[PDB]
Amino acid sequence: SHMDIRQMNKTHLEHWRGLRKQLWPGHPDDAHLADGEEILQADHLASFIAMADGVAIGFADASIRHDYVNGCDSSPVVFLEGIFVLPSFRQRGVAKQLIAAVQRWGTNKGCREMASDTSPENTISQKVHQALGFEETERVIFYRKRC
Amino acid sequence: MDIRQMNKTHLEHWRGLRKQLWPGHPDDAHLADGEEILQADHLASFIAMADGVAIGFADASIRHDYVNGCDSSPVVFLEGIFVLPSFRQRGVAKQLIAAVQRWGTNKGCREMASDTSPENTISQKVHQALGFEETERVIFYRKRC
Ligand SMILES: CC(C)(COP(=O)(O)OP(=O)(O)OC[C@H]1O[C@@H](n2cnc3c(N)ncnc32)[C@H](O)[C@H]1OP(=O)(O)O)[C@@H](O)C(=O)NCCC(=O)NCCS
Numbered sequence A: 001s002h003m004d005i006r007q008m009n010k011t012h013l014e015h016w017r018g019l020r021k022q023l024w025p026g027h028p029d030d031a032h033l034a035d036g037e038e039i040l041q042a043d044h045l046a047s048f049i050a051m052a053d054g055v056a057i058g059f060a061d062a063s064i065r066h067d068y069v070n071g072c073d074s075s076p077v078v079f080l081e082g083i084f085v086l087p088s089f090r091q092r093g094v095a096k097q098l099i100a101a102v103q104r105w106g107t108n109k110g111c112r113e114m115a116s117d118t119s120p121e122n123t124i125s126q127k128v129h130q131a132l133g134f135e136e137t138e139r140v141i142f143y144r145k146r147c
Numbered sequence B: 001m002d003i004r005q006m007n008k009t010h011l012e013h014w015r016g017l018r019k020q021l022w023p024g025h026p027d028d029a030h031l032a033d034g035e036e037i038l039q040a041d042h043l044a045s046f047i048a049m050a051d052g053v054a055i056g057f058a059d060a061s062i063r064h065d066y067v068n069g070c071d072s073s074p075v076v077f078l079e080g081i082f083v084l085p086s087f088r089q090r091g092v093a094k095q096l097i098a099a100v101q102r103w104g105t106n107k108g109c110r111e112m113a114s115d116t117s118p119e120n121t122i123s124q125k126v127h128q129a130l131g132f133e134e135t136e137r138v139i140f141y142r143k144r145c
């Protein structure tokens, strides 16, 4: 059956939020709401929803980052902020298409590089990033200190 | 041992220290990076001097995008720090980071962050000793568009 990757607009907010809560549980509910609104008005944020037969089966959040991005040599960079495909629809090339949409968006925005990150423990994610043409650049430990 | 924010006069020596921190970075880029830092409001480097000679530096930025482990924005980010071996373990880095931290606070950052290689044992101890807590460990990927 035919699938479409739609850049998220107001009409897909509920499809998006319903999936996003499955990728990041306990990311606060109020946060999804605000995030959705922020994204709809941004020029450096965009999200994409995989739709087929009227249902949303997956999504990707993306951004255009001007901060230094680990492993990249140019700026700005289009960055894959999160991606999720429902269990029942995996290994069908849904993420491949969502990522192509993110790449197309960042390319049209003038980015020369697309980047992403994932836990060293997320093994399927690593296989997926590599299967899709990303090469691993570096691994780092992040630190935080309250100001 | 004074710490000063970098200006045009410190570029040549900063570049010499910076090439030792990152030998793989094109010399060509140190040139452009220095100009970029001085032109941008969201960037600042600090130089530690002994008898008028630069012996350490820290590059920093105000980051506005997502930063792993942080929950607020902007974030002051320690982009790199280096102290000549002869001056190590004397609190120079501690001092450089204090200066980065004040700059950040004055820019409204509620969090300061940094990152380092899993292999950089010494760096890890330094971060810990200075009050940073480890947040996440990740692998980065890149695909040329
Ligand atoms: C990671 C994820 C988004 C991939 O979605 P997907 O739609 O199943 O991926 P695709 O079908 O487009 O797969 C692309 C490629 O990755 C590879 N791949 C996908 N799943 C794989 C698996 N489980 N094991 C090994 N390789 C796999 C394949 O090499 C290749 O497709 P093909 O060999 O079947 O021809 C999905 O597993 C998911 O939602 N996981 C949980 C959320 C998550 O971990 N996100 C990652 C970072 S936010």
Ligand SMILES: CC(C)(COP(=O)(O)OP(=O)(O)OC[C@H]1O[C@@H](n2cnc3c(N)ncnc32)[C@H](O)[C@H]1OP(=O)(O)O)[C@@H](O)C(=O)NCCC(=O)NCCS
Binding pocket: B021, B079, B080, B081, B082, B083, B084, B087, B088, B089, B090, B091, B092, B093, B094, B095, B116, B120, B122, B123, B125, B126, B127, B129, B130
């Ligand atoms: C990392 C580096 C900048 C630290 O510089 P420094 O001036 O020697 O550090 P400081 O003296 O200010 O030390 C501050 C804290 O780190 C600790 N520390 C410093 N060097 C240490 C070492 N080699 N092993 C264990 N702990 C160490 C100090 O004991 C502690 O002080 P405290 O008494 O307040 O706890 C320096 O070792 C260096 O330039 N390394 C090479 C470049 C690199 O690794 N950069 C880091 C990532 S960008």
Ligand SMILES: NC[C@H]1O[C@H](O[C@H]2[C@H](O[C@@H]3O[C@H](CO)[C@@H](O)[C@H]3O)[C@@H](O)[C@H](N)C[C@@H]2N)[C@H](N)[C@@H](O)[C@@H]1O
Binding pocket: A024, A025, A026, A027, A080, A081, A082, A083, A116, A117, A118, A119, B066, B068, B069, B136, B138
């Ligand atoms: N590739 C997926 C990435 O997901 C998380 O980071 C995202 C972040 O997720 C937060 O982190 C928790 C999961 O660790 C979620 O609950 C959110 O609050 C999200 O809120 C931002 N809008 C975009 C960030 N990229 C991870 N922090 C990061 O390590 C991981 O690499």
Ligand SMILES: NC[C@H]1O[C@H](O[C@H]2[C@H](O[C@@H]3O[C@H](CO)[C@@H](O)[C@H]3O)[C@@H](O)[C@H](N)C[C@@H]2N)[C@H](N)[C@@H](O)[C@@H]1O
Binding pocket: A068, A070, A071, A138, A140, B022, B023, B024, B025, B078, B079, B080, B081, B115, B116, B117
């Ligand atoms: N705290 C040290 C950090 O240094 C490097 O990242 C810096 C980056 O260094 C590039 O990466 C190579 C070393 O990996 C250098 O040759 C430059 O090209 C520099 O060019 C940017 N101006 C600021 C980045 N923070 C590392 N990429 C990062 O992993 C590391 O944790």
Ligand code: NI
Binding pocket: A002, A003, A004
């Ligand atoms: Ni279609």
